[PDB]
Structure 1
Amino acid sequence: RDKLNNLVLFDKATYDKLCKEVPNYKLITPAVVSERLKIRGSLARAALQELLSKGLIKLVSKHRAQVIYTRNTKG
């Protein structure tokens, strides 16, 4: 089986895309963001951590393995 990779460089365009696609999301996790862009999964995660100091995304989990973000209060 399988072979799939994502961009492992932190990029311009994908960060901008993220923040301006924001009404689409109500569920945000690293994996989702990674798939919908070409951002890594690791650097999916990190982009969210940055994003949360706009506060267009709100923490509702903080688990070690992976985290779950909401978009705004509830959407």
Structure 2
Amino acid sequence: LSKAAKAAAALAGGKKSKKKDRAQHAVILDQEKYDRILKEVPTYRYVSVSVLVDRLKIGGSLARIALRHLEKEGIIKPISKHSKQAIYTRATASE
């Protein structure tokens, strides 16, 4: 019945120990990346940290810094800021 033999309980010992591509974004700018950003952010009707990371291969942190400098140089216009996401446009006079 329910009680197994000691030899069968030895199958507890016989159980044994058996059981059930990264992306390479920039993270550092160069002259070529610097040229790329000020030529393309005039495009990208919507600019944010994630969009810059996705479509310019910047390492996120430097994407944030570049956004502040793009703001300082005025090519960008704010819609909202937050300590975890920011929303930006091309400083468009169209809207």
Question: What TM-score results when the alignment is normalised by the length of structure 2?
Answer: 0.66
| Residue in structure 1 matched with residue 77 of structure 2 by the alignment | 58
Do structure 1's residue 70 and structure 2's residue 71 form an aligned pair?
A: no
Q: Alpha-carbon deviations, 1:21-49, whole Å to 9, x = none?
A: 13321100011111111211111111110
Gaps of 5+ in 1: none
**Aligned-partner Cα distance in 1 for 2:64–2:28:** 13
**What is the percentage of aligned positions where both structures have the same residue?**
47
Residues 1-75 of structure 1: matches in 2 within 5 Å? Answer: 3-73=22-92
| Bigger relative CO (Cα 8 Å, ≥ 6 apart) | 1
Cα distance, 1:51 vs structure 2: 1.0
RMSD (CA atoms): 1.8
Equivalent position amino acid for 1:17 in 2:
R
More helix by share: 2
Q: Deviations over 1:31-73 (max 9, x none)?
A: 1111111211111111110111221101111111111111114
Does the 8 A contact of 2:52 with 2:58 survive in 1?
A: yes
Give unmatched runs, 5+ long, in structure 2: 1-20
Give every structure 1 segment of 4 or more consecutive aligned residues whose post-TM-superposition deviation is greater than 6 Å.
Answer: none
Contact persistence 1:31–1:41 (CA under 8 A): yes
